């Protein structure tokens, strides 16, 4: 019952500062423009200890399956090859991606009926709000 309140199908409804986040991460111009238009559907499921997060959009589909605290390989929407670890910290899912000596952290939290996604790269934060689909 670890992630119960995250489970479901979610749709992006708002974004703030995401272009600046992507610039800070090192995403190139054309990818930033196209990826930044996308309104992904995020589908979160749990089967035993394995959590799966899928994102489906016009631009790209992504999928990760993982066990909390156990590092894994991930290919991001912008095609970085990263080493990721996802943990639960006080009810917040904390996702750290490491690549090329860099790091970024994505936090996912339930707030009212929304799922709020905060993406941090150095001094730049972006907030993405999802609602139930
Ligand atoms: O989950 C969130 O909203 C924030 S991470 C984000 C997810 C994403 C997923 C799809 Cl399928 C299509 C475009 C994008 S935009 C994008 C571009 C670069 C790096 C990550 C992401």
Indicate which CATH number applies to the domain containing 49.
2.40.128.20
Does residue 117 have its Cβ closer than 6 Å to ligand 1? yes
Q: For residue 11, report the phi and psi dihedrals to the nearest 5 degrees.
A: -125, 140
Atom 6, ligand 1: which residue's CA is nearest?
77
The tally of domains found in the chain comes to 1
The tokens describing 69, both together, are 């605290």
Q: Which letter, b or e, does each residue of 47-62 get, where b requires 16 or more Cβ atoms within 10 Å of its Cβ?
A: eeeebebbbebebbeb
User: What resolution in angstroms, rounded to 1 decimal?
Assistant: 1.1
Atom 16, ligand 1: which residue's CA is nearest?
77
Cα 75 to ligand 1 centre (Å)? 11
Length of the chain: 133
What range defines the domain where residue 29 resides?
A: 4-131
Cα 73 to ligand 1 centre (Å)? 17
Determine how many CB atoms are found less than 10 A away from the CB of residue 120: 15
């Amino acid at each position: 019952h670890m992630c119960d309140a995250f489970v479901g199908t979610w749709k992006l409804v708002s974004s703030e500062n995401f272009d600046d986040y992507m610039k800070e991460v090192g995403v190139g111009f054309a990818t930033r423009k196209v990826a930044g238009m996308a309104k992904p559907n995020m589908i979160i499921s749990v089967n035993g200890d394995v959590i799966t997060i899928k994102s489906e959009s016009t631009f790209k589909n992504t999928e990760i399956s993982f066990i909390l605290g156990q590092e894994f390989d991930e290919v991001t929407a912008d095609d970085r090859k990263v080493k990721s670890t996802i943990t639960l910290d006080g009810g917040v899912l904390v996702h750290v991606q490491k690549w090329d000596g860099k790091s970024t952290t994505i936090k996912r939290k339930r707030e009212d009926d929304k799922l709020v996604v905060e993406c941090v790269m150095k001094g730049v934060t972006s907030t993405r709000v999802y609602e139930r689909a």
